[PDB]
Write a structure and sequence with these properties.
Nine copies of one chain form a homononamer.
Chain A lengths: L1 E13 L4 E4 L18 E5 L6 E5 L7 E11 L3 E12 L6 E9 L5 E9 L2 E2 L8 E3 L2 E11 L13 E10 L14
Antiparallel strand pairs in A: 2-5, 3-4, 5-11, 6-10, 6-12, 7-8, 7-11, 8-9
The structure holds a molecule of 6 linked components (NAG-NAG-YZT-BGC-MAN-MAN) (5 copies).
A molecule of 6 linked components (NAG-NAG-YZT-BGC-MAN-MAN) sits at the interface of chains G and H.
PDB class: protein fibril
Keywords: beta-strand addition, isopeptide bond, N-glycosylation, protein fibril
Assembly: nonameric
């Protein structure tokens, strides 16, 4: 039995993150400063700014908006896109109708709008088109429009969960909408 | 003292490689065309396509993906398998949690997924089962999921090293998972 | 002129060979069963198992391994050693960097490793120390690590030749590493 | 009828042998110490060291070497040569291709090489040139390279016979290559 | 008492010897030039070439050959034969098995071979057939094959004695094998 | 002065000789047929077979033998003996050591041996004992053993002379050894 | 005519003979005992011992000797001499060369030698000198040396005749050599 | 009766004897000097030389010779002759065959020979012819040849007697042979 | 005295003598022819033939014979006889022993023998018997045998004398022997 072996050598280094999530990045007090409302939101950036974890409460309102719950610092101009969104709910009925995540400029103008959930299902065209972001600091906000009539009378903490993946390519040319493989 | 001598004669020739690594093999511009991102990856095929050497930077993201960093041309249908993987890191803490190397079709469908490192250790079942590859050109990609909190603030170039060996048997019948002996 | 003549009489008989090379010796189908890969190896035992002749092709891989290309039946426990190795190549540059011949057990564990060529030259300590082999059947395999960059683009059949001599002494005591004289 | 008678008187005495064959001569354990391998060689010196008789077995190997099967003690510096070699075989086909008898120094360096049989026939130039040997003790060894394919499957004890005569002249001047007359 | 007396008168003259033994006869340096090896042979022609006296030493060899120990000049073509051989030995056991005296041409071809002793006894047919010798110069040599095992360890000078008589008739017709009467 | 005269009358007649010397007597070609070797002997019977005259040449041999140089026909059984032998030599040194005259049967068996000269002197007991000869034909031969070293280099014809007298008594009773008186 | 007559008277008596011939005189068996060889001699003493008559045969021998054919008894010491010898032969050629008559002592020593015929003629000095003989008994013998070549092939009885006269004077003083007158 | 007487007167004188017998006549010692051999002859001249008386002994010899037994002196030249011879013997057989009386010269030459007895009888012609004798001295001798076989064994002194008469006429002319008358 | 005278007358005549002595009577030369030997006899007839006178010499011979000294012629037949003989000698001893006178016939036969002296004395019977003589002529001779030893050494002429008388009677009848008277 003839075997030919092919050797690949990978030497892994480390570079400052192109984009990262934070609370008040680079000392800017207007960029991510509502991640700790005592009884309604609690959002923290993941270890080393790799992501954000947010506990959110929706409260029988037609629009539940969470403004400036994290800040996104894009150190180098690159191309961002929404890679994958997963939504699972534990209630009998679907609690969330619409869910959108907004990246806004420092003055509150929407730079990119990301429709996480439309009409109770996750966005079919998951790997959205890579679009360009300039270096700077941006606000991120979340709007959730629920199905009224579904929210339980007794409060809960796991009505639903939404996981979002954002791809950033720090390249000159816009890359194809490459999806995220399962490790 | 009686001695019997047994003479073996080996006449060594040369044959075109069954599989080989390249950048854009056979002029196909969609097969290995991201081996030179200016500041994040630098991957080159070894002399005569015997392997690949890649410098990679991981950057505080939950998934660090390097798509299409080399192309694999399999000139003849054969059986491929992962033979041996070695991983050594120079940092105090383990920088890499998961590391997977994907061989994908030209359209981005995963043909074979090779888990180089799972949960910070190298894959116990090293000589994976030989599986069949048809002749053609394929993309290879690398996904590295780090331990966040371990990546140093100051950049480096030898945080870790991963060496991979792939065995290809150009035979009709699938061979046993023969390991690679030390020369 | 006085001459004294001394007469020696040698009567030559015949005994079964202590060790011999074969393909599937004694009907064991796991001992030498890869001596005929259609386009990459062709290994045959010499007349009456006195040795082996193998045409091998090396193919731009970092390790070219030829597993189970012959079987060695050692009918009686004796002492084996590598007696002499000669290597001549016809190409301008040296094609072979390392060349090792492995004698392995039926389960693929290396019993003795014989470094035919190290770093492009033949092993300086040619008459290796006689070591003991028990009666049984063993696999033999060859690993060739070439100098990449030297292999010609157009295939050939006499890139190089390696001739190996193995000495077997079928004695109770280990003999000195007796070399093989030129007839 | 006239007859003239001429009377010759020869008075025969006795002198220690100039050279003689032995096993471990003069107590030297490194000079002739392999004349009794249990199943492969049995070599004994003739009565009073006048010659050697050896039963040898050849065993399907490309070189069958019998090292140190006798010792030669040359008590006085003289001139040695090969006088006559006769070879007769009882098998249908010739079993022996090459047969050489080596006289080597105590350290295994070949002093004189005597080609008994070359390519299946006895050496045409039988009375080889007398060459000088200094007083001392020397090893003698035999190498037989058979015609593989001719050795019988069932063992035998008279496959062939080789008788060798060595002439030693204990004189200051080298004698002519005097042949051995038939008594 | 009648007595008749018959008177015979013999007048004795002298003629050059028909054949005679010598060392280098007639200045020919290739005819009898080994009658004085310092420690192994000492052969001298008898007074006036009537015969030869040789002290010989036999030395534990299977053939003890004494080449060119005397020269025979046959001035006139005649008929030679072996007349009488006597052998007496002083050792307990017979030291000599075979003893042959060779008359050879100048080029070393055997003209006549005279078996003095065969298998330890003197040749039964003592008065051998007269055979013709042409005028010229010839070599004489002696081969003694001993009984090994009989030669004493301590050297001696009268182990045995062999006396030979050669009859030469210088006549045209071959004479009958006339024996030598005791004076 | 008284004188008495005594007259004796002897009438002398003639009888066939009892014994006589001849060449081939009575037509027997085996009885005296070597009396004329061209250059070495010339023997003739005396007038009427009363004796023999022989010119003989001795030639540097240890035994000079002259076989069948005369024949003796004894017509009537009688008693023969050697009566007187005289030897005179003309050389400075004695040329003849031993000289014996043999009377042999037709088959070559010695009937009577007559030692003419022993050790250079003539036989002291000259009138040897009369011994009986039967009627028939007999060979006579002469053996001369010279003093080597005395024979001259240049040939001669009167080196020495030996005269022999044989007495034959044709009587029934053996006579006393009557000597031969000087006429 | 005056005549004077002178008368002489002789009275003749008789005395024992001083010397006489006989066969075995006085019983002595060693004195005259070969007067009757059957075919070669026949000698008888004359009547009363006055002389001897002998028929003799000469037989082609160089010396024809007739020993002890008569005995001479000399009773009284006297003086003997040869008086007259007459020789006549009937053959064409002279048959007798020498003829001598010997008077010998009892021990065979010659007392007086009488040359009857010398070289074919009778002795010129016929009346030899009277020499003294002592009383006793003596042998007489005859030697005849013939002319070989003259003796006839066919035997005869009167080839020749020799008559001898011996004078004996029985006196004290030696007489003159008185010859024998014709009666 | 007439008677006439005639007277003759003779006057007788005396003259010296013409011839006479003697012993050594006239002092000549060579003329008659053997008349006294002690035991064989005794001859004396008669008184006054008138004759001789001799006792003679004959002794078994073929000739009995008595030399010089008397001397005859013839003083005057005269004529001598034998006148009468008488022979008588006393033995049975005749003892004397021949008897001759010789008158010889002083030198032993026979002057006259007188045959007294021929063949046993006395000479028939008794008065022999007167022959002349010159004056001088002469020897006389007697030869007697007996009949052997007749002589007696015991000696005697009168075997026979012979008487002789010699007539001498001292005259100038030879007388007739006058016989001697009986007185 | 008467006387008667008687006268006788005798007339004497003369007659021729009847017998007479002579020398050569009647011319017969054979009858008396030795009467004159010069020195030994001298005989002459007496005057007229009456007798004879003879001088005779006797000479030491045993018989002294004087033959034919006279002749007797008897003219007439008558009777003769010896009448008287007288013998006288003058020597001391008798010189004559015998003396006889013979009358013989012409042929020498004795007619009558007359013994004058016998044994030294004269014949006793002197007148011998007359015997008859016939007419004729006769010889007369004298023989004298002397006494040897008596004859004188010196010669003489009258040693003795003998005278003889012969009577002749010329008558027819024989007369008586008449003696001769003295005148
Ligand atoms: C297996 O490994 C083998 C190693 O030798 C490879 O053989 C080499 O192939 C080269 C071309 O390969 C490229 O192109 C083919 C398509 O044709 C693709 O399949 C490959 O993926 C790859 O992209 C070739 O390089 C050059 O060759 C030509 C010169 O002969 C040149 O025109 C071409 O444009 C290529 O660039 C190798 O050829 C030899 O090249 C060396 C230079 S180098 O080693 O290539 O850099 C030349 O040496 C020069 O010689 C001159 C004197 O002539 C000297 O003065 C100077 O010092 C020296 O540089 C040789 O002359 C030239 O022959 C070729 N190697 C050999 C030994 O032939 C093989 O492709 C590998 N297999 C695969 C599938 O890639
Ligand atoms: C040492 O070297 C020896 C060289 O002779 C070898 O001896 C030979 O063994 C052969 C069989 O060996 C095979 O099988 C054994 C198990 O039995 C294994 O241990 C071996 O590893 C090996 O796989 C044998 O070959 C054939 O022999 C039979 C015929 O006798 C046949 O039925 C078998 O099926 C084998 O194929 C050799 O035998 C001789 O074979 C030759 C043909 S060939 O040389 O083998 O190709 C025959 O010649 C034919 O003869 C006919 C006339 O009879 C001719 O007309 C024709 O022209 C000719 O081809 C012989 O007749 C036949 O005897 C056998 N060699 C000898 C000389 O006996 C030995 O095995 C070696 N040692 C080892 C351990 O392998
Ligand atoms: C040339 O050929 C010669 C042939 O005779 C050799 O002579 C023999 O040497 C023997 C010893 O040689 C060995 O040792 C020497 C060192 O000393 C080495 O150089 C040699 O290479 C060799 O290894 C000798 O054998 C024995 O001799 C001793 C007895 O005398 C004994 O103590 C020793 O230990 C040896 O074993 C030969 O001696 C004779 O030996 C025979 C027995 S045998 O023939 O050796 O086997 C004895 O016969 C015995 O006698 C008894 C009565 O005594 C009998 O009852 C019995 O039946 C019988 O066996 C002899 O008695 C004994 O003398 C010796 N041969 C002779 C004739 O002396 C010579 O070595 C050769 N040359 C070389 C260089 O090797
Ligand atoms: C047959 O046997 C014969 C025996 O006599 C031999 O005769 C002798 O030949 C000798 C020479 O022979 C050699 O040379 C010839 C070639 O010429 C070869 O064919 C022969 O093979 C052989 O090699 C000869 O010896 C010497 O002779 C010369 C002197 O005459 C001398 O110059 C030479 O150089 C030789 O060396 C024999 O001659 C006699 O020699 C003795 C000495 S010896 O006996 O030779 O050693 C001399 O005696 C000396 O005399 C002196 C007084 O003169 C004394 O004072 C002294 O004491 C004494 O030594 C003689 O004088 C000398 O004549 C010669 N022998 C005779 C008797 O002549 C013959 O060669 C034999 N046949 C063959 C074919 O070889
Ligand atoms: C000298 O010559 C003489 C010649 O007569 C020799 O005298 C004869 O001697 C005879 C014996 O001589 C032998 O013996 C003596 C020793 O005694 C030796 O010395 C001799 O050498 C010799 O050998 C003698 O012969 C025989 O005599 C005996 C008889 O008397 C007799 O017994 C003996 O045995 C002898 O044989 C001669 O004697 C006479 O012999 C004749 C016979 S014959 O003549 O001898 O043959 C007899 O005649 C016979 O007589 C009878 C009548 O009686 C007749 O009837 C018959 O016809 C007749 O034969 C005589 O009677 C006898 O006397 C003897 N001769 C004489 C005459 O006496 C003498 O020996 C010589 N000298 C020497 C030294 O030998």
């Amino acid at each position: 039995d003839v075997i030919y072996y092919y050797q690949g050598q990978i030497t892994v280094g480390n570079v400052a993150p192109p984009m990262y999530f934070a609370i008040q990045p680079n000392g800017n007090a207007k960029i991510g400063n509502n991640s700790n409302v005592p009884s309604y939101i609690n959002a923290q950036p993941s270890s080393g700014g790799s992501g954000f974890t947010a506990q959110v409460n929706i409260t029988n309102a037609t629009y539940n908006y969470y403004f400036n719950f994290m800040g996104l610092a894009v150190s180098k101009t690159g191309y961002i896109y929404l890679a994958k969104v997963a939504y699972s709910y534990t209630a009998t009925n679907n609690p969330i109708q619409n869910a959108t995540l907004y990246i806004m400029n420092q003055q509150g103008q929407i730079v990119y709008k990301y429709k996480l959930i439309v009409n109770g299902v996750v966005n079919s065209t998951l790997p959205s088109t890579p679009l360009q972001i300039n270096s700077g600091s941006y606000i991120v906000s979340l709007l959730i429009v629920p199905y009224q009539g579904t929210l339980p009378k007794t409060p809960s903490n796991d009505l639903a969960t939404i996981t979002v993946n954002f791809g950033f390519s720090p390249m000159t040319a816009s890359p194809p909408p490459i999806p995220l493989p399962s490790p």
